[PDB]
Design a protein around this ligand. Structure first.
Ligand SMILES: [Ca+2]
Ligand SMILES: [Cl-]
Ligand SMILES: [Zn+2]
Ligand SMILES: [Zn+2]
Ligand SMILES: [Zn+2]
Ligand SMILES: [Zn+2]
Lengths: 120, 401
Protein backbone atom coordinates (compact mmCIF):
# COMPACT_ATOMS: atom_id res chain seq x y z
CA UNK A 1 0.00 0.00 0.00
CA UNK A 2 3.01 2.31 -0.21
CA UNK A 3 3.47 4.72 -3.13
CA UNK A 4 6.74 6.14 -4.47
CA UNK A 5 7.11 9.00 -6.95
CA UNK A 6 10.26 9.21 -9.11
CA UNK A 7 11.04 12.55 -7.40
CA UNK A 8 11.48 10.71 -4.11
CA UNK A 9 8.14 11.41 -2.45
CA UNK A 10 6.90 8.30 -0.62
CA UNK A 11 3.41 8.07 0.94
CA UNK A 12 0.77 5.61 2.15
CA UNK A 13 -2.39 5.26 0.05
CA UNK A 14 -5.48 5.79 2.25
CA UNK A 15 -7.67 2.70 2.43
CA UNK A 16 -10.58 2.90 -0.02
CA UNK A 17 -9.14 5.64 -2.23
CA UNK A 18 -8.13 5.54 -5.88
CA UNK A 19 -4.64 6.87 -6.59
CA UNK A 20 -3.10 8.79 -9.47
CA UNK A 21 0.38 10.19 -9.98
CA UNK A 22 0.78 13.90 -10.67
CA UNK A 23 3.77 15.99 -11.76
CA UNK A 24 5.16 16.31 -8.19
CA UNK A 25 3.21 13.79 -6.15
CA UNK A 26 -0.13 11.96 -6.02
CA UNK A 27 -3.90 12.64 -6.13
CA UNK A 28 -6.38 10.47 -4.17
CA UNK A 29 -10.16 10.17 -4.76
CA UNK A 30 -12.54 8.37 -2.40
CA UNK A 31 -13.83 5.03 -3.72
CA UNK A 32 -17.35 4.26 -4.90
CA UNK A 33 -19.72 6.96 -6.15
CA UNK A 34 -20.46 9.03 -3.07
CA UNK A 35 -22.60 12.10 -2.71
CA UNK A 36 -19.83 13.96 -0.92
CA UNK A 37 -16.47 12.21 -1.49
CA UNK A 38 -13.22 13.42 0.06
CA UNK A 39 -10.38 14.29 -2.30
CA UNK A 40 -6.72 14.50 -1.24
CA UNK A 41 -3.49 15.52 -2.92
CA UNK A 42 0.16 15.26 -1.79
CA UNK A 43 3.20 16.81 -3.43
CA UNK A 44 6.90 17.51 -3.06
CA UNK A 45 7.28 21.27 -3.28
CA UNK A 46 10.34 23.53 -3.49
CA UNK A 47 8.69 26.87 -2.79
CA UNK A 48 8.18 27.55 0.92
CA UNK A 49 4.66 28.08 2.34
CA UNK A 50 3.22 31.61 2.39
CA UNK A 51 3.97 33.67 5.52
CA UNK A 52 1.58 33.99 8.49
CA UNK A 53 -0.24 30.64 8.27
CA UNK A 54 -1.57 28.81 11.31
CA UNK A 55 0.57 26.01 12.75
CA UNK A 56 0.04 22.76 14.58
CA UNK A 57 2.40 20.14 15.91
CA UNK A 58 2.10 17.13 13.62
CA UNK A 59 3.54 13.92 15.04
CA UNK A 60 7.16 14.85 15.78
CA UNK A 61 7.33 18.25 14.04
CA UNK A 62 5.14 21.19 12.99
CA UNK A 63 2.97 21.97 9.97
CA UNK A 64 1.72 25.24 8.51
CA UNK A 65 -1.81 25.28 7.06
CA UNK A 66 -4.96 27.12 6.09
CA UNK A 67 -8.57 26.02 5.62
CA UNK A 68 -10.64 27.87 3.05
CA UNK A 69 -14.46 27.81 3.06
CA UNK A 70 -16.80 28.53 0.13
CA UNK A 71 -20.54 28.26 -0.63
CA UNK A 72 -21.41 24.70 -1.59
CA UNK A 73 -24.79 23.03 -2.02
CA UNK A 74 -27.32 21.04 0.04
CA UNK A 75 -24.52 18.81 1.36
CA UNK A 76 -22.92 21.84 3.02
CA UNK A 77 -20.22 24.42 2.41
CA UNK A 78 -17.07 23.45 0.47
CA UNK A 79 -13.91 23.19 2.62
CA UNK A 80 -10.29 22.94 1.43
CA UNK A 81 -7.23 22.28 3.57
CA UNK A 82 -3.80 23.36 2.38
CA UNK A 83 -0.97 22.15 4.64
CA UNK A 84 2.81 21.92 4.48
CA UNK A 85 5.60 20.43 6.55
CA UNK A 86 9.34 20.84 6.04
CA UNK A 87 11.02 17.79 4.53
CA UNK A 88 14.73 18.47 4.30
CA UNK A 89 15.39 21.83 2.66
CA UNK A 90 12.06 21.49 0.88
CA UNK A 91 8.41 20.93 1.75
CA UNK A 92 5.69 18.35 1.49
CA UNK A 93 2.29 19.85 0.72
CA UNK A 94 -1.11 18.20 1.21
CA UNK A 95 -4.43 19.69 0.10
CA UNK A 96 -7.83 18.15 0.74
CA UNK A 97 -11.47 19.00 0.06
CA UNK A 98 -14.81 17.90 1.43
CA UNK A 99 -18.24 19.42 2.02
CA UNK A 100 -19.64 19.77 5.49
CA UNK A 101 -22.76 21.42 6.91
CA UNK A 102 -21.41 21.00 10.45
CA UNK A 103 -18.55 23.50 10.23
CA UNK A 104 -14.88 22.72 9.47
CA UNK A 105 -14.01 19.04 8.82
CA UNK A 106 -11.27 17.37 10.88
CA UNK A 107 -9.43 16.43 7.67
CA UNK A 108 -8.11 13.49 9.67
CA UNK A 109 -7.16 11.46 6.61
CA UNK A 110 -5.33 14.44 5.13
CA UNK A 111 -3.26 15.06 8.27
CA UNK A 112 -2.42 11.35 8.47
CA UNK A 113 -1.27 11.42 4.84
CA UNK A 114 0.99 14.46 5.45
CA UNK A 115 2.22 13.05 8.76
CA UNK A 116 3.54 9.79 7.35
CA UNK A 117 4.79 11.32 4.08
CA UNK A 118 8.56 11.64 3.44
CA UNK A 119 10.97 12.48 0.64
CA UNK A 120 13.14 9.29 0.79
CA UNK B 1 -71.81 42.30 10.68
CA UNK B 2 -73.24 39.17 12.27
CA UNK B 3 -69.66 38.23 13.14
CA UNK B 4 -68.58 41.61 14.51
CA UNK B 5 -71.64 41.55 16.75
CA UNK B 6 -70.80 38.08 18.05
CA UNK B 7 -67.15 38.89 18.72
CA UNK B 8 -67.95 42.17 20.50
CA UNK B 9 -69.98 40.30 23.11
CA UNK B 10 -67.62 37.31 23.30
CA UNK B 11 -64.81 39.67 24.28
CA UNK B 12 -66.78 42.21 26.31
CA UNK B 13 -66.12 42.85 29.98
CA UNK B 14 -69.02 43.27 32.43
CA UNK B 15 -69.14 44.42 36.05
CA UNK B 16 -67.18 41.91 38.17
CA UNK B 17 -66.36 40.00 34.96
CA UNK B 18 -63.14 41.15 33.34
CA UNK B 19 -61.84 37.93 31.85
CA UNK B 20 -62.31 36.50 28.38
CA UNK B 21 -62.20 32.74 28.76
CA UNK B 22 -60.42 30.17 26.63
CA UNK B 23 -63.80 28.98 25.35
CA UNK B 24 -64.83 32.49 24.32
CA UNK B 25 -61.42 32.98 22.71
CA UNK B 26 -61.92 29.81 20.65
CA UNK B 27 -65.40 30.86 19.59
CA UNK B 28 -63.98 34.19 18.43
CA UNK B 29 -61.37 32.45 16.29
CA UNK B 30 -63.91 30.01 14.89
CA UNK B 31 -66.23 32.94 14.08
CA UNK B 32 -63.45 34.81 12.36
CA UNK B 33 -62.60 31.72 10.30
CA UNK B 34 -66.22 31.04 9.30
CA UNK B 35 -66.89 34.63 8.26
CA UNK B 36 -68.09 35.32 4.72
CA UNK B 37 -67.47 39.06 5.05
CA UNK B 38 -64.13 39.31 6.93
CA UNK B 39 -63.22 42.80 5.70
CA UNK B 40 -66.65 44.14 6.71
CA UNK B 41 -66.31 42.48 10.11
CA UNK B 42 -62.94 44.14 10.78
CA UNK B 43 -64.30 47.46 9.57
CA UNK B 44 -67.18 47.03 12.03
CA UNK B 45 -64.92 46.11 14.96
CA UNK B 46 -62.65 49.03 14.28
CA UNK B 47 -65.65 51.39 14.12
CA UNK B 48 -66.78 50.03 17.51
CA UNK B 49 -63.36 50.64 19.00
CA UNK B 50 -63.33 46.87 19.58
CA UNK B 51 -60.44 45.93 17.32
CA UNK B 52 -57.62 46.81 19.72
CA UNK B 53 -59.54 45.08 22.54
CA UNK B 54 -59.81 41.91 20.43
CA UNK B 55 -56.02 41.66 20.16
CA UNK B 56 -55.49 42.65 23.80
CA UNK B 57 -57.96 40.11 25.16
CA UNK B 58 -57.12 36.88 23.30
CA UNK B 59 -54.22 36.13 25.56
CA UNK B 60 -52.53 32.74 25.43
CA UNK B 61 -49.93 32.90 22.64
CA UNK B 62 -51.24 29.76 20.94
CA UNK B 63 -54.68 31.38 20.59
CA UNK B 64 -53.16 34.76 19.68
CA UNK B 65 -51.35 33.01 16.81
CA UNK B 66 -54.60 31.47 15.48
CA UNK B 67 -56.44 34.79 15.84
CA UNK B 68 -53.75 36.83 14.17
CA UNK B 69 -53.02 34.36 11.36
CA UNK B 70 -56.78 34.07 10.59
CA UNK B 71 -57.32 37.85 10.49
CA UNK B 72 -54.12 38.54 8.55
CA UNK B 73 -55.08 35.76 6.16
CA UNK B 74 -58.67 36.71 5.22
CA UNK B 75 -58.47 40.52 5.18
CA UNK B 76 -57.69 42.78 2.26
CA UNK B 77 -59.10 46.29 2.34
CA UNK B 78 -59.12 46.25 6.14
CA UNK B 79 -55.77 44.57 6.56
CA UNK B 80 -53.96 47.69 7.66
CA UNK B 81 -56.65 48.64 10.18
CA UNK B 82 -56.22 45.25 11.85
CA UNK B 83 -52.44 45.68 11.61
CA UNK B 84 -52.55 49.09 13.31
CA UNK B 85 -54.79 47.78 16.11
CA UNK B 86 -52.38 44.87 16.71
CA UNK B 87 -49.43 47.28 16.90
CA UNK B 88 -51.39 49.41 19.38
CA UNK B 89 -52.19 46.32 21.46
CA UNK B 90 -48.48 45.42 21.61
CA UNK B 91 -47.37 48.66 23.32
CA UNK B 92 -46.46 47.67 26.91
CA UNK B 93 -47.74 44.16 26.21
CA UNK B 94 -45.08 42.89 23.79
CA UNK B 95 -44.89 39.09 24.18
CA UNK B 96 -47.73 38.45 21.73
CA UNK B 97 -47.11 35.42 19.49
CA UNK B 98 -43.34 35.23 20.07
CA UNK B 99 -43.10 31.97 22.09
CA UNK B 100 -42.24 28.30 21.44
CA UNK B 101 -41.62 27.55 17.74
CA UNK B 102 -42.24 31.19 16.89
CA UNK B 103 -39.71 32.71 19.25
CA UNK B 104 -37.67 34.24 16.42
CA UNK B 105 -40.62 36.22 15.02
CA UNK B 106 -41.75 39.46 16.62
CA UNK B 107 -45.53 39.54 16.76
CA UNK B 108 -45.94 42.16 14.02
CA UNK B 109 -43.60 40.04 11.88
CA UNK B 110 -45.85 37.05 12.57
CA UNK B 111 -48.78 39.14 11.29
CA UNK B 112 -46.91 40.27 8.18
CA UNK B 113 -45.68 36.75 7.36
CA UNK B 114 -49.26 35.43 7.52
CA UNK B 115 -50.63 38.29 5.36
CA UNK B 116 -47.92 37.92 2.69
CA UNK B 117 -48.18 34.12 2.74
CA UNK B 118 -51.96 34.14 2.38
CA UNK B 119 -51.69 36.63 -0.51
CA UNK B 120 -49.08 34.48 -2.24
CA UNK B 121 -51.10 31.28 -1.74
CA UNK B 122 -54.10 33.00 -3.33
CA UNK B 123 -52.12 34.57 -6.17
CA UNK B 124 -49.88 31.60 -6.94
CA UNK B 125 -52.52 28.88 -6.59
CA UNK B 126 -51.80 26.91 -3.44
CA UNK B 127 -54.36 28.16 -0.92
CA UNK B 128 -56.08 24.77 -0.78
CA UNK B 129 -55.57 21.12 -1.74
CA UNK B 130 -56.76 17.89 -0.16
CA UNK B 131 -54.11 15.34 0.81
CA UNK B 132 -53.37 12.64 -1.78
CA UNK B 133 -50.79 10.71 0.27
CA UNK B 134 -50.16 9.66 3.88
CA UNK B 135 -47.15 10.29 6.13
CA UNK B 136 -44.75 7.49 7.05
CA UNK B 137 -44.55 6.45 10.70
CA UNK B 138 -40.77 5.85 10.55
CA UNK B 139 -38.54 7.40 13.19
CA UNK B 140 -35.09 6.38 11.99
CA UNK B 141 -33.03 5.47 8.93
CA UNK B 142 -33.24 6.90 5.37
CA UNK B 143 -36.54 8.62 4.52
CA UNK B 144 -37.49 9.34 8.15
CA UNK B 145 -37.06 13.11 7.95
CA UNK B 146 -39.98 15.58 7.63
CA UNK B 147 -40.35 14.70 3.93
CA UNK B 148 -41.52 11.24 4.90
CA UNK B 149 -43.06 11.81 8.31
CA UNK B 150 -44.64 15.27 8.32
CA UNK B 151 -42.99 15.81 11.69
CA UNK B 152 -41.72 19.38 11.83
CA UNK B 153 -38.02 19.74 12.62
CA UNK B 154 -38.91 22.55 15.09
CA UNK B 155 -41.18 20.14 16.99
CA UNK B 156 -38.45 17.55 17.61
CA UNK B 157 -37.09 17.17 21.17
CA UNK B 158 -33.67 18.55 22.07
CA UNK B 159 -30.95 16.14 21.13
CA UNK B 160 -30.24 13.95 24.14
CA UNK B 161 -27.53 15.31 26.46
CA UNK B 162 -25.04 12.48 25.99
CA UNK B 163 -25.23 12.77 22.22
CA UNK B 164 -25.10 16.53 22.46
CA UNK B 165 -21.74 16.21 24.23
CA UNK B 166 -20.36 13.72 21.71
CA UNK B 167 -21.41 16.02 18.86
CA UNK B 168 -19.76 18.99 20.61
CA UNK B 169 -16.69 16.83 21.21
CA UNK B 170 -16.54 16.28 17.43
CA UNK B 171 -16.94 12.55 18.02
CA UNK B 172 -16.69 10.96 14.55
CA UNK B 173 -19.38 8.28 15.15
CA UNK B 174 -22.04 10.47 16.77
CA UNK B 175 -21.54 13.02 14.02
CA UNK B 176 -22.36 10.28 11.51
CA UNK B 177 -25.47 9.29 13.45
CA UNK B 178 -26.82 12.85 13.02
CA UNK B 179 -25.59 13.21 9.48
CA UNK B 180 -26.69 11.95 6.03
CA UNK B 181 -27.86 8.34 6.49
CA UNK B 182 -26.60 7.06 3.14
CA UNK B 183 -23.15 6.03 1.94
CA UNK B 184 -23.68 3.70 -1.02
CA UNK B 185 -26.52 5.43 -2.90
CA UNK B 186 -27.00 2.68 -5.51
CA UNK B 187 -27.20 0.06 -2.72
CA UNK B 188 -30.07 2.01 -1.13
CA UNK B 189 -32.02 2.30 -4.42
CA UNK B 190 -31.62 -1.49 -4.92
CA UNK B 191 -33.59 -1.97 -1.72
CA UNK B 192 -36.66 -0.49 -3.42
CA UNK B 193 -38.94 -1.82 -6.15
CA UNK B 194 -40.50 0.58 -8.67
CA UNK B 195 -43.72 0.52 -6.63
CA UNK B 196 -41.77 1.16 -3.37
CA UNK B 197 -40.27 4.28 -5.04
CA UNK B 198 -43.56 5.49 -6.40
CA UNK B 199 -44.98 4.98 -2.87
CA UNK B 200 -42.21 7.17 -1.34
CA UNK B 201 -43.03 9.79 -3.98
CA UNK B 202 -46.73 9.76 -3.07
CA UNK B 203 -45.96 9.94 0.65
CA UNK B 204 -43.59 12.86 0.07
CA UNK B 205 -45.81 14.88 -2.20
CA UNK B 206 -49.34 13.83 -1.21
CA UNK B 207 -49.33 14.71 2.50
CA UNK B 208 -50.23 18.22 3.80
CA UNK B 209 -47.42 20.73 4.20
CA UNK B 210 -45.93 20.75 7.69
CA UNK B 211 -46.43 24.51 8.15
CA UNK B 212 -45.74 26.91 11.01
CA UNK B 213 -48.63 29.06 9.85
CA UNK B 214 -51.62 26.74 9.43
CA UNK B 215 -54.25 29.48 10.13
CA UNK B 216 -52.88 31.67 7.35
CA UNK B 217 -54.73 29.24 5.04
CA UNK B 218 -58.53 29.55 4.46
CA UNK B 219 -59.08 25.92 5.47
CA UNK B 220 -56.68 23.01 6.03
CA UNK B 221 -53.03 23.39 4.86
CA UNK B 222 -52.61 22.31 1.21
CA UNK B 223 -50.70 19.22 0.09
CA UNK B 224 -47.04 19.64 -0.76
CA UNK B 225 -47.90 18.60 -4.33
CA UNK B 226 -50.05 21.73 -4.73
CA UNK B 227 -47.24 23.98 -3.48
CA UNK B 228 -44.62 22.31 -5.72
CA UNK B 229 -46.96 22.78 -8.66
CA UNK B 230 -47.29 26.50 -7.80
CA UNK B 231 -43.51 26.92 -7.38
CA UNK B 232 -42.89 25.15 -10.66
CA UNK B 233 -45.24 27.52 -12.49
CA UNK B 234 -43.56 30.52 -10.84
CA UNK B 235 -39.97 29.53 -11.75
CA UNK B 236 -40.69 27.87 -15.10
CA UNK B 237 -39.72 24.44 -13.78
CA UNK B 238 -41.83 21.29 -13.51
CA UNK B 239 -43.14 19.80 -10.28
CA UNK B 240 -41.48 16.49 -11.30
CA UNK B 241 -38.08 18.21 -11.24
CA UNK B 242 -38.74 19.88 -7.88
CA UNK B 243 -40.06 16.59 -6.53
CA UNK B 244 -37.03 14.66 -7.76
CA UNK B 245 -34.59 17.03 -6.09
CA UNK B 246 -36.54 16.91 -2.81
CA UNK B 247 -37.18 13.13 -2.81
CA UNK B 248 -33.44 12.53 -3.24
CA UNK B 249 -32.67 14.89 -0.33
CA UNK B 250 -35.34 13.23 1.82
CA UNK B 251 -34.09 9.69 1.15
CA UNK B 252 -30.74 10.94 2.41
CA UNK B 253 -32.37 12.33 5.55
CA UNK B 254 -33.45 11.02 8.95
CA UNK B 255 -35.41 12.35 11.92
CA UNK B 256 -32.13 12.72 13.86
CA UNK B 257 -30.57 14.71 11.03
CA UNK B 258 -33.62 17.06 11.06
CA UNK B 259 -33.10 17.65 14.80
CA UNK B 260 -29.38 18.41 14.32
CA UNK B 261 -30.09 20.54 11.25
CA UNK B 262 -32.54 22.81 13.02
CA UNK B 263 -31.11 22.82 16.55
CA UNK B 264 -27.55 23.63 15.45
CA UNK B 265 -28.82 26.50 13.32
CA UNK B 266 -30.63 28.21 16.20
CA UNK B 267 -28.05 27.31 18.87
CA UNK B 268 -25.40 29.69 20.22
CA UNK B 269 -23.33 28.65 17.18
CA UNK B 270 -25.84 29.75 14.52
CA UNK B 271 -24.58 26.88 12.38
CA UNK B 272 -24.92 27.22 8.61
CA UNK B 273 -26.83 23.91 8.23
CA UNK B 274 -29.03 22.69 5.35
CA UNK B 275 -32.64 22.63 6.46
CA UNK B 276 -35.98 21.11 5.56
CA UNK B 277 -37.43 19.45 2.44
CA UNK B 278 -34.93 20.74 -0.13
CA UNK B 279 -32.12 21.01 2.40
CA UNK B 280 -31.64 24.71 1.79
CA UNK B 281 -28.60 26.33 3.42
CA UNK B 282 -29.41 29.21 5.78
CA UNK B 283 -26.87 31.71 4.33
CA UNK B 284 -27.90 30.76 0.81
CA UNK B 285 -31.55 31.61 1.47
CA UNK B 286 -30.43 35.01 2.76
CA UNK B 287 -27.90 35.68 -0.03
CA UNK B 288 -30.27 34.80 -2.87
CA UNK B 289 -33.42 36.08 -1.15
CA UNK B 290 -35.08 32.70 -1.57
CA UNK B 291 -38.35 33.80 0.12
CA UNK B 292 -38.90 36.59 -2.44
CA UNK B 293 -42.14 35.24 -3.83
CA UNK B 294 -43.88 34.57 -0.53
CA UNK B 295 -42.72 37.55 1.54
CA UNK B 296 -42.45 41.24 0.71
CA UNK B 297 -39.12 43.04 0.86
CA UNK B 298 -39.56 44.71 4.29
CA UNK B 299 -40.49 41.45 6.03
CA UNK B 300 -37.69 39.50 4.31
CA UNK B 301 -34.86 41.87 4.99
CA UNK B 302 -35.90 42.22 8.62
CA UNK B 303 -35.79 38.51 9.47
CA UNK B 304 -33.08 37.42 11.86
CA UNK B 305 -30.90 34.56 10.74
CA UNK B 306 -32.58 32.18 13.17
CA UNK B 307 -35.95 33.30 11.81
CA UNK B 308 -34.81 32.31 8.32
CA UNK B 309 -33.72 28.85 9.62
CA UNK B 310 -37.15 28.53 11.18
CA UNK B 311 -38.99 29.44 7.95
CA UNK B 312 -36.88 26.84 6.10
CA UNK B 313 -38.50 24.31 8.46
CA UNK B 314 -41.94 25.45 7.18
CA UNK B 315 -42.69 23.28 4.12
CA UNK B 316 -44.18 25.91 1.84
CA UNK B 317 -41.32 28.38 2.38
CA UNK B 318 -38.86 25.55 1.81
CA UNK B 319 -40.51 24.35 -1.42
CA UNK B 320 -40.45 27.86 -2.90
CA UNK B 321 -36.87 28.53 -1.80
CA UNK B 322 -35.85 25.16 -3.25
CA UNK B 323 -37.52 25.92 -6.57
CA UNK B 324 -36.17 29.47 -6.70
CA UNK B 325 -32.71 28.02 -6.01
CA UNK B 326 -33.08 25.36 -8.71
CA UNK B 327 -34.01 28.07 -11.24
CA UNK B 328 -30.97 30.08 -10.06
CA UNK B 329 -28.59 27.16 -10.65
CA UNK B 330 -30.15 26.64 -14.08
CA UNK B 331 -30.01 30.34 -15.03
CA UNK B 332 -26.39 30.47 -13.82
CA UNK B 333 -25.52 27.43 -15.95
CA UNK B 334 -26.97 29.08 -19.04
CA UNK B 335 -24.42 31.88 -18.52
CA UNK B 336 -21.43 29.56 -18.52
CA UNK B 337 -18.92 28.62 -21.19
CA UNK B 338 -18.92 24.86 -21.69
CA UNK B 339 -15.36 24.87 -23.01
CA UNK B 340 -14.37 26.15 -19.56
CA UNK B 341 -16.14 23.24 -17.83
CA UNK B 342 -14.39 20.18 -19.31
CA UNK B 343 -15.04 17.89 -16.35
CA UNK B 344 -18.73 18.78 -16.54
CA UNK B 345 -18.71 18.20 -20.32
CA UNK B 346 -16.94 14.88 -19.75
CA UNK B 347 -19.43 13.61 -17.16
CA UNK B 348 -22.53 14.84 -19.02
CA UNK B 349 -21.85 14.72 -22.80
CA UNK B 350 -25.38 15.76 -23.81
CA UNK B 351 -25.49 18.82 -21.56
CA UNK B 352 -27.08 21.84 -23.27
CA UNK B 353 -26.37 25.06 -21.37
CA UNK B 354 -28.69 27.30 -23.38
CA UNK B 355 -31.60 24.91 -22.74
CA UNK B 356 -31.29 25.55 -18.98
CA UNK B 357 -32.87 28.95 -19.62
CA UNK B 358 -36.07 27.18 -20.68
CA UNK B 359 -38.48 24.67 -19.13
CA UNK B 360 -37.12 21.31 -17.90
CA UNK B 361 -39.58 19.59 -20.29
CA UNK B 362 -37.05 20.52 -22.95
CA UNK B 363 -33.79 19.80 -21.16
CA UNK B 364 -31.69 16.78 -22.07
CA UNK B 365 -31.63 14.28 -19.21
CA UNK B 366 -27.92 15.15 -18.79
CA UNK B 367 -29.03 18.66 -17.76
CA UNK B 368 -30.95 17.14 -14.89
CA UNK B 369 -28.01 14.94 -13.97
CA UNK B 370 -25.63 17.90 -14.03
CA UNK B 371 -27.94 20.19 -12.09
CA UNK B 372 -28.30 17.46 -9.44
CA UNK B 373 -24.53 17.46 -8.99
CA UNK B 374 -24.58 21.24 -8.89
CA UNK B 375 -27.39 21.36 -6.37
CA UNK B 376 -25.74 19.16 -3.76
CA UNK B 377 -22.38 20.88 -4.35
CA UNK B 378 -21.10 24.35 -5.34
CA UNK B 379 -22.63 25.08 -8.73
CA UNK B 380 -20.55 25.17 -11.93
CA UNK B 381 -17.02 25.11 -10.46
CA UNK B 382 -16.30 22.00 -12.57
CA UNK B 383 -16.18 19.81 -9.46
CA UNK B 384 -18.80 17.08 -9.60
CA UNK B 385 -20.67 14.82 -7.22
CA UNK B 386 -20.07 11.24 -8.46
CA UNK B 387 -23.19 9.80 -6.82
CA UNK B 388 -25.86 12.48 -6.73
CA UNK B 389 -26.65 12.67 -10.47
CA UNK B 390 -27.84 9.07 -10.79
CA UNK B 391 -29.58 9.28 -7.40
CA UNK B 392 -31.67 12.30 -8.41
CA UNK B 393 -32.15 10.86 -11.91
CA UNK B 394 -33.76 7.76 -10.41
CA UNK B 395 -36.21 9.94 -8.42
CA UNK B 396 -36.84 11.90 -11.61
CA UNK B 397 -37.62 8.73 -13.59
CA UNK B 398 -40.18 7.77 -10.92
CA UNK B 399 -41.89 11.17 -11.10
CA UNK B 400 -41.71 11.18 -14.89
CA UNK B 401 -43.25 7.71 -14.99
CA1 LIG C 1 -29.59 15.18 4.57
CL1 LIG D 1 -65.92 41.35 3.35
ZN1 LIG E 1 10.07 17.36 -9.99
ZN1 LIG F 1 -67.31 36.74 28.83
ZN1 LIG G 1 -28.39 18.03 7.46
ZN1 LIG H 1 -19.91 21.49 -8.21
Amino acid sequence: MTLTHPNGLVVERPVGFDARRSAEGFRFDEGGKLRNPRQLEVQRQDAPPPPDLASRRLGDGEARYKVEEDDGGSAGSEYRLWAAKPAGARWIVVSASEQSEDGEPTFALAWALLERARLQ
Amino acid sequence: TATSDLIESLISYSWDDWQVTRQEARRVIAAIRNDNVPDATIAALDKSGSLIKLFQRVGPPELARSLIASIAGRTTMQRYQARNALIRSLINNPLGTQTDNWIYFPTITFFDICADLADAAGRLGFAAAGATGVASQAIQGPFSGVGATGVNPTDLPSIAFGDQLKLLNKDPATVTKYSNPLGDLGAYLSQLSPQDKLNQAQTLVGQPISTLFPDAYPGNPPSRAKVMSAAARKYDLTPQLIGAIILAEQRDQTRDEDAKDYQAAVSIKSANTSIGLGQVVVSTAIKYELFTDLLGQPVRRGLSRKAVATLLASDEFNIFATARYIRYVANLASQQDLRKLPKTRGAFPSIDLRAYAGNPRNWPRDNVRALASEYTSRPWDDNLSPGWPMFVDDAYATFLD
